[PDB]
């Protein structure tokens, strides 16, 4: 069967927990462990296709060695998460762009950038400031709400989408 490993990563407090447990579980957490790295599969059909999503929900101290490179590389395609309600996450998107793009050794690695906490009304980073953003680095950009489910499916499926495009070349 078709498998895709997806990695969700971003700074912490993004929501990048509760997206993953919105996909996995249907359910929203108000709160969860920051500190806990965990693995969910689930069977989808995407345009016709069944698969099976690898999701890593990404946590942990920040350190830099060679086990962990090496699981990072191994992920098909990423999702940058920012939570809207906080600049210095969307700041943050850079790094972790970077990242990936070093341990995959390609410019070419299929990523979808997510704008989590949209039902937020405290917003600091602007719709527009986003899309730009995206449009520069090539990638699809979905807002999304883990906690009214809003985008979340749009945002998993539109990187499997972007990981066949990948694949086609
Ligand atoms: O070997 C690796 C390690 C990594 C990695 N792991 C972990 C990282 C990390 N943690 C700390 C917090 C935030 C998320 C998790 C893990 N809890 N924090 C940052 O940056 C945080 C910032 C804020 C404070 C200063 N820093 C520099 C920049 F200002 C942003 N970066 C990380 C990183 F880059 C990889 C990430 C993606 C792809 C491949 C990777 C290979
Ligand atoms: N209002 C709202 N709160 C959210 C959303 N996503 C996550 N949260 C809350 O933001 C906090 C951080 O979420 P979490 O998934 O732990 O972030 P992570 O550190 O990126 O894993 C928790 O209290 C979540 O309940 C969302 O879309 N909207
Ligand atoms: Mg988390």
Not at 61 to 89: C, H, P, W
Not at 100 to 115: A, C, F, H, N, T
């Amino acid at each position: 069967m078709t498998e895709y490993k997806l990695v969700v990563v971003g700074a912490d407090g993004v929501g990048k927990s509760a997206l993953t447990i919105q996909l996995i579980q249907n359910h929203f957490v108000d709160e969860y462990d920051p500190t806990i790295e965990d693995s969910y599969r689930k069977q989808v059909v995407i345009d016709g296709e069944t698969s099976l999503l690898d999701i890593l929900d990404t946590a942990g101290q920040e350190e830099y060695s060679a086990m962990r490179d090496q699981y990072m590389r191994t992920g098909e395609g990423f999702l940058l998460v920012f939570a809207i309600n906080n600049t210095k996450s969307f700041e943050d998107i850079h790094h972790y762009r970077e990242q990936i793009k070093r341990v995959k050794d390609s410019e070419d690695v299929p990523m979808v950038l997510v704008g989590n906490k949209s039902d937020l009304p405290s917003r600091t980073v602007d719709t527009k400031q986003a899309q730009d953003l995206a449009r520069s680095y090539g990638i699809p950009f979905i807002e999304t709400s883990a906690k009214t489910r809003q985008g979340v499916d749009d945002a998993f499926y539109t990187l499997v989408r972007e990981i066949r495009k990948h694949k086609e070349k």
